[model samples]
Target: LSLPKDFEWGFATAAYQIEGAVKEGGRGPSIWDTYCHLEPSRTNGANGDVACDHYHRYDEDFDLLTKYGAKAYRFSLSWSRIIPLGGRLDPINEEGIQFYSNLIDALLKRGVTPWVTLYHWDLPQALHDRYGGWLNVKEVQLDFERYARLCFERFGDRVKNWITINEPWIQSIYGYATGSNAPGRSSINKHSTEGDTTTEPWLAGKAQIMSHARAVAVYSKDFRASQKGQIGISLNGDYYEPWDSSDPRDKEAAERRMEFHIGWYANPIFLKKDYPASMRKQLGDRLPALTPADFAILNAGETDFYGMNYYTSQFARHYEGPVPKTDFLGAIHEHQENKDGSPVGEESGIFWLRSCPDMFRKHLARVHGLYGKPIYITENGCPCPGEDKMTCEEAINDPFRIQYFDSHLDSISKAISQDGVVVKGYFAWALLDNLEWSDGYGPRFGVTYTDYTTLKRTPKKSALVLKDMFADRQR
Candidate 1:
């Protein structure tokens, strides 16, 4: 079976994850830069300072992407580079604009469409320093608008797709609530010195959703028709099931988990509704309230497409004991195995993710049936075991990564043909193995292997498999 002829398949990488010229091209500091350079280094003593050097070597990389049969390349623009002072008050950096403009033109030249993500967790350090980042709603919403509008005005002409933010869930939960990512802030973080994990996550989440709506509204009102581009946010979530499906409480917990997780943001953005009932019932006033005007923006800018970044699935068991009021969002036991000691799916290099393509298709059906929007699988890839330590030849012959893609793609095809899901595209998690945030470069999610020591890229077996699969359907 084959996907529709118009289906797009490609590769994705974030600027902070792959772009190395952190201080070059008039780029200012980002929260990620500060986090990675912290004492003892929050990373594995590894920073993206000279990552794939894609900053300087994208031309070489674009050549590889076309060879790998990519029809589109999803990447992010650095906020720090755009506004050097990290404020709307700062002068727009012509060099940064020129750099991206050249990059976009080059992608078009190579016959690969550019899917641009406006923000990808690399907040300018100055914004966090002054306004507590997303914690302060007004500053984030207003500043992000200025940032997004500039990109629209400058590049929206040729960039046919725009992602307002990449995984706001990760931004709030990992960066604010868990202190696992940049600008690490959490009440219980071992590294962070200050943060109230309880209230901060919800506050920052509301700010990002509002910012997403504003950016979309700005594009729809001013740029969409003229530029002929589409804008949306990429939300990363897992397919969750009940640990004990027979138990009513567990079943309810799984449903509630969806609400507490994806529904919390999607409810407002797509449905123009308040926070989910499960969240409001537990957090009450702790969850930020949406204003009447906020609803207006959301309703006006309801997305043209839905972007999903799915990787894993889990089994939810209702939490029966006491926990903090703020931790209620996580107040459920998540298990990888079931009551009978059966694993949900095969394990991967990462402890958190388990390969479950069945669940992936289910999730596709659920989201499509529920939201009724064109869906794009923005990120889905595997981190093979010890690929980082393997020799170049050994790493490039990756069998597991091939299976991961083949299985996931087959399920995605089934979702579209059988389940009636409006899946428009699928982008593998990354183009190269570069800085994996807190895990640093240890986890390899790229079908194209990168030699961190030499910065050379080699296509893995998975790349060829995907090429054959997609290119076979081209005719």
Candidate 2:
């Protein structure tokens, strides 16, 4: 019925999502900057140049957060902002460093803990230009290690919880295969000048894992003893249920989905194994093999805890045809309903998400069952329907989002109390409505509504309810 007393309940935001003043603070241009300003608009004709004005207004934002009863905040540092050139040899930007140092100090002043994500999909365009970015695994990992070592040397004393990377799967597939996100490059995308969907996605993912391993190794070697900080990577994957519960293949289909989605990352780090067997058999030569040396590095990189970001669940049905080219997934087809038309969960404002809290429990249990790490709900929340079109007054009354948080919280409580899951904390998806990658500012996932015009943040009905919900549970 409640969380542990020490359980953290807060909000999450990324630098690029909230922080504006992209050109200020001696920041370097990132791949996202190049992608957004290109022809055919990769970001819904909206960019973060003035997003919530958070770069300048962070103190005001944190003031609002303290008012909401948040004890922690999960936010990311902009890599390009810290090192404009984004190379090991590049000079560090003191202004960029000072910005975060001040931001972290403000949190401590307000009794709020800071959860810093080292990277959040914003790669310095200079690195991308110099080499092929994540395409050069050997080169990128070295730079990432250096960048991470710098963050530890500078800020590890206060920022106790550090997440190395955010959603590597999405970064790989969307950035390389589908060309839907930043650094967009795909063979199928007409706008992309060069990409091989068949090969690049997994290669990009491999590079991320390598980068993650290097960062962890650096932290373990130098910072952990003095800093006493925990480091992990955040992964986002929806729980999958079999569309046809009576069918065997459909059951396997559900397992396949988790393996591809969760196991692909977890197996290497948690299980001391390479990519999932499901991926190995299906992708064959396309799957990057982890060498013995790679495993040794990966073996040392086991996350201090599990960071899971969930929003929805899907019904998986066994596939009959040959898998689509450039679509590297387990042998499963996704559905929102079964043949008899039972929806998996209530529809969300976003197309992919739905209210499936029962599956939320299953997802938690499964992760703990396999990984055996204390779990933190790193990011979870629903967007208010049509908040993009609603007036500030109208948008502040988000009952849909209220129910979304209520149900998910209850499911998590049960996962802890009844299912024997060692749950530690929960960080809601966002604090304010800001850029949502290709969707831009259209889909508002924030409990606190951001009036983009004035950059004013208004606590919506859901935010108020969640504040009470988490506070009551604390009692």
Candidate 3:
């Protein structure tokens, strides 16, 4: 089945992941730069120092987007690149502003809409040294507000879609509690000797919520009147189902997992100003409290749509045993196999992602029921496992990725047609194979394969799949 006439089809990429030239264009060092350089082994000794060279070749990249028939393109802005010191207190970098301005202009020329993410896990390292980054709410919020405001005043005229923050859960838990990503810090995990898993996650989460809320308010107050645009947060979560469907404990565990994943961050903006009951009850005093003013900020930032990134589903089994509070879903439940001992779906290169299009449809329906807002699948794609063994021609002929897109896109159509979901847009996880965070450059999630040696982009079969699908929509 084809998507709705108004449905948006696009590809997504993050600035830090794709934009190489860490030193050029007056860009200041970010936490990822510091973390990757300091501990190269954390990312298999592969850093994004020269990631797809998108920095120098965005013109060529934009051409590819046009050829791929992507109606919209979602990408992020580098905080340090815009504000060198990562805060409003410092001077704005004209070079950074000019770079995005040129890119936006190019997209407009090609009749492609620009969807901008204000922050995508790239925190200016200076902010960390000054006030512990997200751990210190006051400074980070102020800096983020300033940075966001700049984007509004400059790019708001052309960019109609804005995401305040991308995947705050990953930013907080992975960066702080797990120490898997940049600025790697963890009190309990083996990745780092520093960081409090119990308290730091909540503090970091609170900071992000406050930052997004403030940015939303600023956009609505200042720019919305002149340059109309919609603002929201992009959250990533997997559908959690009961490992043992007959066991009520497992069912409850599934609910708990959802509450902790999307509910923890999204509740403030979508439902209430506080964390979910499950989180508050489990963490008790450990979870940070929000003030009356905090509620006011969050309420102002009530999102217009749900920016969702779903990959796979997990089978949740109840666990009463002791586990670290920061072990993500591990604290409340054990994500085990289904009772029949089959995989959730076909496994991808990234261990977390399993192909299950039925679960995708279910997740979309669930989010619509909860939020009652238009939904955008901002990031969804399969990882190309064992690509190193295949030649460039072999990798580009990726029938597996093509199937992944076909099934997932069909699921979105199901949600829209069958379940009454206001699903309006779908953006594949990435436009090019760039940095994969802690997994490094091994797992390829891009429809367009990027040669690490030459930094050239080649459209995979999946890219052709999207082109044909979207091209059919045009007809």
Candidate 4:
């Protein structure tokens, strides 16, 4: 492989997925907590209340990162952990700060750089109830100032790679639009604020994009020079293959599909600062008019590199006429649901993700070509086998995962060597299985299998393969 020697190699996970001490260390209720308890039917009868127990098992995971030669590990801090009440840190939680402080010190000591994400969908439920979460514009300024300051104040000195928001698109569309995840409520709630009805997904999404840009600007002005940290947002994007490869209409449809999924946010920051041209037309007057200041933030071009969270690829096609809007975003195409759940091509454990090597390469090339920015695979990994009351140990030999990595790496080589794309990093989806979120303990993304029952972890076959790949890449 002709990829750069310094390309970052690590894994990523969310706080709620891994740090499952929801009540410990003076933590308050997050929207996820409320959702899981209230709406029993939303998820697969699962919640992250007691995920991987990572909050207390940090040392074990930190050691795992070191063993993998991970140059970086991207994770989020629980907002409720620091501010039990929504926005105020009035009664500072020394324990909360100490927990992250210890983690930071440990990662640094082990030659592993920490990539801190300010917020990753774990909003304090108090904020959601009192001020309408991201719905009300009033929450924007308060959230921007509060979160940016807290992150910089605590771990800014040690951690330079700061992701302001993980995926606002998912947060709005899934949580607010479809009511599938935590705090699930459709904005078109003509009846009640807590129901499964109408939702203004696009309008709500615009609000999230603006919120992120505002927070990024705050970091640039308040802490960049003093802390010298790189601030960016992680956009979870999937590569869409047109259902009809030779059909021009199908190709066009695929482009629109992928753009709406990711370009909804990226184009605002990296390209036009306005919604995508097609989207603008679709939205007509419904889209929020960007003010001069909002436009400035949108185009601030603050990203050092586009942080990409990729899982699997899918096929897309253009319909002849009257396109059907997807229930998720009310759009025609482009989405992620682990498309292949069974072992057809590659076995990454979970079904939605099928091992498609060529698509992986195309995904990297496509992002770099369109966005014209450096790329980082912020999140990429398959689900290791874990089901039918079987532990990850019974399914850890993951040669399918090895092939999955090799093919993606080969694609990385093509992008860098042939396409001249500056591929900065490749952080696997996660370090340990941890919590699979709404899917529960079904889909495992960890190279090292995590026994959720005892929080005990073991390296699977792919772990050794990944370690060897990292070793060879390092040299």
Find the 10 residues in a row with the least total lDDT in model 3. Answer: 327-336
lDDT of 2: 0.88
The sequence of per-residue lDDT tens digits that candidate 1 reaches over residues 422-475 is: 899999998888789989888999888898888989988888778887766544
What lDDT does candidate 1 reach at residue 165?
A: 91
- For residue 471, model 2's alpha carbon misses the true position, in angstroms, by 2.6
Q: What lDDT tens digits, residue by residue, belong to model 4 across residues 1-475?
A: 6567778788788899889889999988898888767544456777788888888788888888877767788888887887766574445577888888888898899888998887888888888788777676656546656766876888888988888788777887777776666677864533255643333566567767776777777777788889887877788856777665687766776787777788888887767467777766555565566678778766664767788887777766555554334244324443332234322245446667767767778888888888898887777788644432555657577776677777788888888888778888888877877666667777777788887667788877776678688667556
Cα lDDT for residue 359, candidate 3: 83
The global C-alpha lDDT for each of the candidates, from Candidate 1 onward, is: 0.87, 0.88, 0.85, 0.73
- lDDT (tens digit, per residue) of candidate 3 on 144-188: 998999899899889999999999999988887777777788887
Which stretches of candidate 4 lie above 4 Å from their native place?
A: 39-41, 88-92, 187-199, 299-301, 320-348, 385-389
Give the range where candidate 2 is weakest over 10 consecutive residues by summed lDDT. Answer: 322-331
The superposed Cα distance between candidate 4 and the true structure at residue 282, in angstroms, equals 1.7
* RMSD to true structure for each model, in Å: 1.2, 1.2, 1.5, 3.4
Error of 1 at 272 (Å): 1.0
Ranking by lDDT: 2, 1, 3, 4
Candidates 1 and 2 compared by lDDT, better number = 2
Q: How far in Å is the alpha carbon of 261 misplaced in model 2?
A: 1.3
- For candidate 2, the TM-score is 0.98
| lDDT tens digits by residue: candidate 2, 1-475 | 6877888889999998899899998998989888888777878898877778899898899997887888999999999999998999999999999999999999999999999999999999999999989878889989999999999988998899999999998988898888888798899886735888889988898899889898988888788888898999899998989999999999998999999888888888767788978899888888888989998998775578888999999999999988866776677889999878999999877888799999999999999998888888899998866666788899889888888888998999999999899888899988988899888898998988888877788888876677788778768
TM-score of each: 0.98, 0.98, 0.97, 0.91
Quote the lDDT for 345 in model 3. 85
Residue pairs with clashing backbones, model 1:
none
Q: What's model 4's lDDT at 391? A: 59
